[PDB]
PDB file of C-alpha atoms in Angstrom:
ATOM      1  CA  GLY M   1     -22.854  20.493   9.436  1.00  0.00           C
ATOM      2  CA  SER M   2     -22.561  17.451   7.183  1.00  0.00           C
ATOM      3  CA  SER M   3     -20.529  14.321   7.920  1.00  0.00           C
ATOM      4  CA  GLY M   4     -20.061  11.358   5.600  1.00  0.00           C
ATOM      5  CA  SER M   5     -16.612  10.964   4.064  1.00  0.00           C
ATOM      6  CA  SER M   6     -15.292   9.834   7.448  1.00  0.00           C
ATOM      7  CA  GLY M   7     -15.291   6.070   6.990  1.00  0.00           C
ATOM      8  CA  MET M   8     -12.397   4.889   4.836  1.00  0.00           C
ATOM      9  CA  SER M   9     -10.744   2.117   6.849  1.00  0.00           C
ATOM     10  CA  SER M  10      -6.951   2.094   6.565  1.00  0.00           C
ATOM     11  CA  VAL M  11      -5.075  -1.186   6.128  1.00  0.00           C
ATOM     12  CA  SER M  12      -1.558  -2.337   5.247  1.00  0.00           C
ATOM     13  CA  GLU M  13      -3.180  -3.741   2.106  1.00  0.00           C
ATOM     14  CA  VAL M  14      -3.449  -1.616  -1.038  1.00  0.00           C
ATOM     15  CA  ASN M  15      -0.903   0.660   0.638  1.00  0.00           C
ATOM     16  CA  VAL M  16       2.709   1.697   0.046  1.00  0.00           C
ATOM     17  CA  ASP M  17       5.458   3.030   2.310  1.00  0.00           C
ATOM     18  CA  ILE M  18       5.912   6.797   2.057  1.00  0.00           C
ATOM     19  CA  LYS M  19       9.462   5.940   0.992  1.00  0.00           C
ATOM     20  CA  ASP M  20       8.247   4.164  -2.144  1.00  0.00           C
ATOM     21  CA  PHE M  21       5.796   6.976  -2.891  1.00  0.00           C
ATOM     22  CA  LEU M  22       8.718   9.411  -2.869  1.00  0.00           C
ATOM     23  CA  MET M  23      11.345   7.222  -4.537  1.00  0.00           C
ATOM     24  CA  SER M  24       8.804   6.776  -7.333  1.00  0.00           C
ATOM     25  CA  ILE M  25       9.133  10.479  -8.129  1.00  0.00           C
ATOM     26  CA  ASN M  26      12.692  10.882  -6.851  1.00  0.00           C
ATOM     27  CA  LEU M  27      11.517  13.010  -3.925  1.00  0.00           C
ATOM     28  CA  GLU M  28      12.810  10.700  -1.194  1.00  0.00           C
ATOM     29  CA  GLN M  29      14.678  13.800  -0.023  1.00  0.00           C
ATOM     30  CA  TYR M  30      11.540  14.596   1.973  1.00  0.00           C
ATOM     31  CA  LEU M  31      11.626  11.208   3.701  1.00  0.00           C
ATOM     32  CA  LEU M  32      13.008  12.582   6.967  1.00  0.00           C
ATOM     33  CA  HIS M  33      10.407  15.352   6.788  1.00  0.00           C
ATOM     34  CA  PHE M  34       7.367  13.105   6.360  1.00  0.00           C
ATOM     35  CA  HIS M  35       8.691  10.559   8.859  1.00  0.00           C
ATOM     36  CA  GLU M  36       9.376  13.089  11.616  1.00  0.00           C
ATOM     37  CA  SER M  37       6.042  14.747  10.836  1.00  0.00           C
ATOM     38  CA  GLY M  38       4.340  11.423  11.492  1.00  0.00           C
ATOM     39  CA  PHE M  39       3.724  10.019   8.018  1.00  0.00           C
ATOM     40  CA  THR M  40       4.767   6.413   7.404  1.00  0.00           C
ATOM     41  CA  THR M  41       2.509   5.481   4.490  1.00  0.00           C
ATOM     42  CA  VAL M  42       0.885   7.473   1.687  1.00  0.00           C
ATOM     43  CA  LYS M  43      -2.561   7.032   3.235  1.00  0.00           C
ATOM     44  CA  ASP M  44      -1.562   9.075   6.283  1.00  0.00           C
ATOM     45  CA  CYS M  45      -1.106  11.825   3.695  1.00  0.00           C
ATOM     46  CA  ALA M  46      -4.893  11.952   3.369  1.00  0.00           C
ATOM     47  CA  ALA M  47      -5.038  14.983   5.661  1.00  0.00           C
ATOM     48  CA  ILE M  48      -2.008  16.653   4.082  1.00  0.00           C
ATOM     49  CA  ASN M  49      -2.087  19.765   1.898  1.00  0.00           C
ATOM     50  CA  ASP M  50       0.328  22.119   0.139  1.00  0.00           C
ATOM     51  CA  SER M  51       0.181  24.236   3.296  1.00  0.00           C
ATOM     52  CA  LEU M  52       1.513  21.311   5.330  1.00  0.00           C
ATOM     53  CA  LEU M  53       4.130  20.413   2.719  1.00  0.00           C
ATOM     54  CA  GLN M  54       5.661  23.894   2.745  1.00  0.00           C
ATOM     55  CA  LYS M  55       5.323  23.737   6.531  1.00  0.00           C
ATOM     56  CA  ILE M  56       7.185  20.500   7.249  1.00  0.00           C
ATOM     57  CA  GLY M  57      10.146  22.197   5.598  1.00  0.00           C
ATOM     58  CA  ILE M  58       9.731  21.729   1.855  1.00  0.00           C
ATOM     59  CA  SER M  59      11.329  24.969   0.668  1.00  0.00           C
ATOM     60  CA  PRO M  60      10.827  24.568  -3.103  1.00  0.00           C
ATOM     61  CA  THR M  61       7.240  24.494  -4.365  1.00  0.00           C
ATOM     62  CA  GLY M  62       7.834  22.913  -7.759  1.00  0.00           C
ATOM     63  CA  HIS M  63       8.304  19.733  -5.740  1.00  0.00           C
ATOM     64  CA  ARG M  64       5.243  20.169  -3.524  1.00  0.00           C
ATOM     65  CA  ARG M  65       2.862  20.028  -6.488  1.00  0.00           C
ATOM     66  CA  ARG M  66       4.614  16.912  -7.787  1.00  0.00           C
ATOM     67  CA  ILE M  67       4.165  15.296  -4.374  1.00  0.00           C
ATOM     68  CA  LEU M  68       0.486  16.162  -3.948  1.00  0.00           C
ATOM     69  CA  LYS M  69      -0.346  15.339  -7.566  1.00  0.00           C
ATOM     70  CA  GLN M  70       0.703  11.716  -7.074  1.00  0.00           C
ATOM     71  CA  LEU M  71      -0.879  11.502  -3.620  1.00  0.00           C
ATOM     72  CA  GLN M  72      -4.195  12.419  -5.244  1.00  0.00           C
ATOM     73  CA  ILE M  73      -3.895   9.680  -7.864  1.00  0.00           C
ATOM     74  CA  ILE M  74      -2.762   7.143  -5.267  1.00  0.00           C
ATOM     75  CA  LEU M  75      -5.146   7.968  -2.422  1.00  0.00           C
ATOM     76  CA  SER M  76      -8.024   7.993  -4.909  1.00  0.00           C
ATOM     77  CA  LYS M  77      -7.085   4.423  -5.824  1.00  0.00           C
ATOM     78  CA  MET M  78      -6.810   3.187  -2.237  1.00  0.00           C
ATOM     79  CA  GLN M  79     -10.141   1.353  -2.152  1.00  0.00           C
ATOM     80  CA  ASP M  80     -11.524  -1.922  -0.800  1.00  0.00           C
ATOM     81  CA  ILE M  81     -13.660  -2.652  -3.860  1.00  0.00           C
ATOM     82  CA  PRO M  82     -13.569  -5.755  -6.098  1.00  0.00           C
ATOM     83  CA  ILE M  83     -12.150  -5.716  -9.626  1.00  0.00           C
ATOM     84  CA  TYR M  84     -14.832  -4.991 -12.222  1.00  0.00           C
ATOM     85  CA  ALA M  85     -13.831  -4.582 -15.868  1.00  0.00           C
ATOM     86  CA  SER M  86     -15.830  -5.816 -18.860  1.00  0.00           C
ATOM     87  CA  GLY M  87     -15.237  -5.571 -22.596  1.00  0.00           C
ATOM     88  CA  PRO M  88     -17.388  -4.543 -25.582  1.00  0.00           C
ATOM     89  CA  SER M  89     -20.918  -5.780 -24.895  1.00  0.00           C
ATOM     90  CA  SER M  90     -24.406  -4.262 -24.854  1.00  0.00           C
ATOM     91  CA  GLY M  91     -26.541  -7.110 -23.549  1.00  0.00           C
TER      92      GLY M  91
END
């Protein structure tokens, strides 16, 4: 076995309410689903997968993909690293 990923420390910071994550794509219709399931923020959706989406109730798939897609972009961002962006320069 190999363990490593396990480490990311959750925090209200750099985080958004599941509601906002859905309203951003107009999928707030799954608010009661995520809430009841036990998902308040997007982060909590770190252990979520299409399988779970279609499980919670999500009948239509076309929506599932749209939900996960964003989650991937968001979650990926969720980081506790400083801002580092430089312009055109060699040395």
